[PDB]
């Protein structure tokens, strides 16, 4: 087969972690407009028949626990898995409301040996977050 | 037997090392464009080609507007990282 099997009973889960307000200890600006993103994503993935679960302002420990829990669910009847992270970040890092989390730590729960009911199935991670402080000034064409 | 890292797709909003831009009232450039291209093409195109249209929409239609010259007139290209082994069709 050249195409992933997409006719399981369910398309799968779409986890949206939307971090707008950060702890005063971090000093991070509030991420205005992210609510518009989360609502757009919820509606877009509803029309693709995903079970959308919106989560708002999670700490670094709540993200890991949420991801651990979801990866231990039974996805046997689901065609794929989608996770969307809307937050501040750096290269390889997503921010909980209270500090950084390694992206690798999140995605590792879904490795083919750790989440067996997703083995052979598409696992999609959509990451809206900076990856550094470099600036692209562009080139006129 | 397959690799344990097989069948992941990481759709990043921006290139490695770079800032990612967000409009304070309409949302991030990337999520805006992703939702627009999924609405328009999820019933016609394979996912990687949908993300390529997203790349083009962010790259060509968006440029930063900032009262701080450091952050003004800036650009962005998303970054598709695919360890998928098959094509992905939503229809």
């Amino acid at each position: 087969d050249n195409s992933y099997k997409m006719d399981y009973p369910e398309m799968g889960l779409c986890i949206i972690i939307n971090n707008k307000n950060f702890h005063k200890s971090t000093g991070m600006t509030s991420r205005s407009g992210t609510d518009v993103d989360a609502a757009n994503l919820r509606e877009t993935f509803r029309n693709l028949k995903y079970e959308v679960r919106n989560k708002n302002d999670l700490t670094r420990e709540e993200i890991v626990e949420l991801m651990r829990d979801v990866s231990k669910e039974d996805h046997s009847k689901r065609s794929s898995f989608v996770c969307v992270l809307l937050s501040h970040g750096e290269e390889g890092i997503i921010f909980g409301t209270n500090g950084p989390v390694d992206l690798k730590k999140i995605t590792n729960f879904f490795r083919g040996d750790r989440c067996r009911s997703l083995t052979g199935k598409p696992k999609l991670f959509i990451i809206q977050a900076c990856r550094g402080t470099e600036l692209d000034c562009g080139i006129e064409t | 037997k397959i690799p344990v890292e097989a069948d992941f797709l990481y759709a990043y909003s921006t290139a490695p090392g770079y800032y990612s831009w967000r409009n304070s009232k309409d949302g991030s450039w990337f999520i805006q464009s992703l939702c627009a291209m999924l609405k328009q093409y999820a019933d016609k195109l394979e996912f990687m080609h949908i993300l390529t249209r997203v790349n083009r929409k962010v790259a060509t239609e968006f440029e930063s507007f900032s009262f701080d010259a450091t952050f003004h007139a800036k650009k962005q290209i998303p970054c598709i990282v695919s360890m998928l082994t098959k094509e992905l069709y939503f229809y």
Binding site: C130 | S13, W21, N23, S24, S28, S64, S66, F71
Partner: peptide
């Protein structure tokens, strides 16, 4: 009104 993430 463009800001960084």
């Amino acid at each position: 009104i463009t800001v960084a993430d």
